[PDB]
Amino acid sequence: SMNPKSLTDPKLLKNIPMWLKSLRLHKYSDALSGTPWIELIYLDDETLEKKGVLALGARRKLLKAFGIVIDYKERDLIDRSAY
Ligand SMILES: [Ca+2]
């Protein structure tokens, strides 16, 4: 889950359904699996709700995970193999 090493694992970033499963959020794979991680992590609360993530808790958990990935990305600390 909120192990930064798991969240930023290139294997998981390149497999969003499994990335979501690691957080127990795979039920939203239907709406999110098409979105590459580089785009996915910047989605906001409003967009997540509009895409079917209706539960406040779920949006908060996604946005927390996203934030961790963004931090590594913006420091150029995500392995280039993920891109
Ligand atoms: Ca929901």
PDB file of C-alpha atoms and ligand atoms in Angstrom:
ATOM      1  CA  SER A   1       0.000   0.000   0.000  1.00  0.00           C
ATOM      2  CA  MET A   2       1.638   3.242   1.263  1.00  0.00           C
ATOM      3  CA  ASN A   3       5.090   1.889   0.971  1.00  0.00           C
ATOM      4  CA  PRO A   4       6.704   4.431  -1.384  1.00  0.00           C
ATOM      5  CA  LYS A   5       8.852   1.634  -2.868  1.00  0.00           C
ATOM      6  CA  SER A   6       5.765  -0.314  -3.852  1.00  0.00           C
ATOM      7  CA  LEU A   7       3.903   2.745  -5.166  1.00  0.00           C
ATOM      8  CA  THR A   8       6.851   3.770  -7.340  1.00  0.00           C
ATOM      9  CA  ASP A   9       7.777   0.248  -8.517  1.00  0.00           C
ATOM     10  CA  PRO A  10       8.082   0.550 -12.347  1.00  0.00           C
ATOM     11  CA  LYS A  11       6.368  -2.865 -12.710  1.00  0.00           C
ATOM     12  CA  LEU A  12       3.351  -1.586 -10.812  1.00  0.00           C
ATOM     13  CA  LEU A  13       3.263   1.886 -12.412  1.00  0.00           C
ATOM     14  CA  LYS A  14       3.180   0.130 -15.814  1.00  0.00           C
ATOM     15  CA  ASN A  15       0.305  -2.093 -14.604  1.00  0.00           C
ATOM     16  CA  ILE A  16      -2.374   0.196 -13.238  1.00  0.00           C
ATOM     17  CA  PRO A  17      -4.895  -2.587 -12.474  1.00  0.00           C
ATOM     18  CA  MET A  18      -2.213  -4.221 -10.248  1.00  0.00           C
ATOM     19  CA  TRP A  19      -1.137  -0.845  -8.841  1.00  0.00           C
ATOM     20  CA  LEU A  20      -4.774  -0.318  -7.840  1.00  0.00           C
ATOM     21  CA  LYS A  21      -5.026  -3.873  -6.442  1.00  0.00           C
ATOM     22  CA  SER A  22      -1.993  -3.196  -4.179  1.00  0.00           C
ATOM     23  CA  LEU A  23      -4.122  -0.499  -2.541  1.00  0.00           C
ATOM     24  CA  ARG A  24      -7.314  -2.615  -2.561  1.00  0.00           C
ATOM     25  CA  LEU A  25      -8.790  -0.214  -5.096  1.00  0.00           C
ATOM     26  CA  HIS A  26      -9.036  -2.554  -8.100  1.00  0.00           C
ATOM     27  CA  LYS A  27     -12.813  -2.021  -8.347  1.00  0.00           C
ATOM     28  CA  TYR A  28     -12.026   1.306 -10.064  1.00  0.00           C
ATOM     29  CA  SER A  29      -9.894  -0.387 -12.719  1.00  0.00           C
ATOM     30  CA  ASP A  30     -12.870  -0.198 -15.132  1.00  0.00           C
ATOM     31  CA  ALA A  31     -12.589   3.599 -15.375  1.00  0.00           C
ATOM     32  CA  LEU A  32      -8.888   4.053 -14.700  1.00  0.00           C
ATOM     33  CA  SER A  33      -6.951   1.210 -16.455  1.00  0.00           C
ATOM     34  CA  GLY A  34      -6.675   3.164 -19.755  1.00  0.00           C
ATOM     35  CA  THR A  35      -4.967   6.122 -18.090  1.00  0.00           C
ATOM     36  CA  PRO A  36      -1.139   5.888 -18.030  1.00  0.00           C
ATOM     37  CA  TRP A  37       0.441   6.469 -14.614  1.00  0.00           C
ATOM     38  CA  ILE A  38       2.039   9.789 -15.639  1.00  0.00           C
ATOM     39  CA  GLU A  39      -1.512  11.127 -16.244  1.00  0.00           C
ATOM     40  CA  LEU A  40      -3.327   9.075 -13.561  1.00  0.00           C
ATOM     41  CA  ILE A  41      -1.359  10.490 -10.598  1.00  0.00           C
ATOM     42  CA  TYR A  42      -2.322  14.074 -11.400  1.00  0.00           C
ATOM     43  CA  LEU A  43      -6.095  13.442 -11.424  1.00  0.00           C
ATOM     44  CA  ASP A  44      -7.946  15.519  -8.850  1.00  0.00           C
ATOM     45  CA  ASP A  45     -10.747  14.748  -6.389  1.00  0.00           C
ATOM     46  CA  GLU A  46     -13.456  16.105  -8.717  1.00  0.00           C
ATOM     47  CA  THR A  47     -12.236  14.100 -11.704  1.00  0.00           C
ATOM     48  CA  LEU A  48     -11.980  10.887  -9.640  1.00  0.00           C
ATOM     49  CA  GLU A  49     -15.593  11.314  -8.451  1.00  0.00           C
ATOM     50  CA  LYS A  50     -16.752  12.022 -12.009  1.00  0.00           C
ATOM     51  CA  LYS A  51     -14.969   8.820 -13.124  1.00  0.00           C
ATOM     52  CA  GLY A  52     -16.891   6.695 -10.612  1.00  0.00           C
ATOM     53  CA  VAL A  53     -14.827   6.813  -7.456  1.00  0.00           C
ATOM     54  CA  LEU A  54     -17.901   7.778  -5.438  1.00  0.00           C
ATOM     55  CA  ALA A  55     -16.541   6.974  -1.960  1.00  0.00           C
ATOM     56  CA  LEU A  56     -14.780   9.900  -0.233  1.00  0.00           C
ATOM     57  CA  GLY A  57     -12.427   7.421   1.521  1.00  0.00           C
ATOM     58  CA  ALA A  58     -11.401   5.854  -1.768  1.00  0.00           C
ATOM     59  CA  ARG A  59     -10.707   9.238  -3.409  1.00  0.00           C
ATOM     60  CA  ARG A  60      -8.633  10.264  -0.385  1.00  0.00           C
ATOM     61  CA  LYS A  61      -6.598   7.048  -0.475  1.00  0.00           C
ATOM     62  CA  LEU A  62      -5.958   7.399  -4.221  1.00  0.00           C
ATOM     63  CA  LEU A  63      -4.959  11.063  -3.874  1.00  0.00           C
ATOM     64  CA  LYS A  64      -2.583  10.156  -0.984  1.00  0.00           C
ATOM     65  CA  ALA A  65      -0.945   7.410  -3.071  1.00  0.00           C
ATOM     66  CA  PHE A  66      -0.788   9.771  -6.068  1.00  0.00           C
ATOM     67  CA  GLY A  67       0.949  12.424  -3.931  1.00  0.00           C
ATOM     68  CA  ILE A  68       3.720  10.001  -2.957  1.00  0.00           C
ATOM     69  CA  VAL A  69       4.297   9.092  -6.631  1.00  0.00           C
ATOM     70  CA  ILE A  70       4.234  12.777  -7.666  1.00  0.00           C
ATOM     71  CA  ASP A  71       6.903  13.599  -5.062  1.00  0.00           C
ATOM     72  CA  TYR A  72       9.268  10.932  -6.448  1.00  0.00           C
ATOM     73  CA  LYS A  73       8.444  11.898 -10.044  1.00  0.00           C
ATOM     74  CA  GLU A  74       9.106  15.597  -9.554  1.00  0.00           C
ATOM     75  CA  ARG A  75      12.493  14.781  -7.941  1.00  0.00           C
ATOM     76  CA  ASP A  76      13.265  12.488 -10.954  1.00  0.00           C
ATOM     77  CA  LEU A  77      13.396   9.494  -8.566  1.00  0.00           C
ATOM     78  CA  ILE A  78      11.185   7.130 -10.549  1.00  0.00           C
ATOM     79  CA  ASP A  79      13.132   4.570 -12.546  1.00  0.00           C
ATOM     80  CA  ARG A  80      13.222   5.488 -16.246  1.00  0.00           C
ATOM     81  CA  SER A  81      11.941   1.933 -17.036  1.00  0.00           C
ATOM     82  CA  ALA A  82       8.520   3.090 -15.757  1.00  0.00           C
ATOM     83  CA  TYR A  83       8.124   5.719 -18.490  1.00  0.00           C
TER      84      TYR A  83
HETATM   85 CA    CA B   1     -17.219   4.080  -4.725  1.00  0.00          CA
END
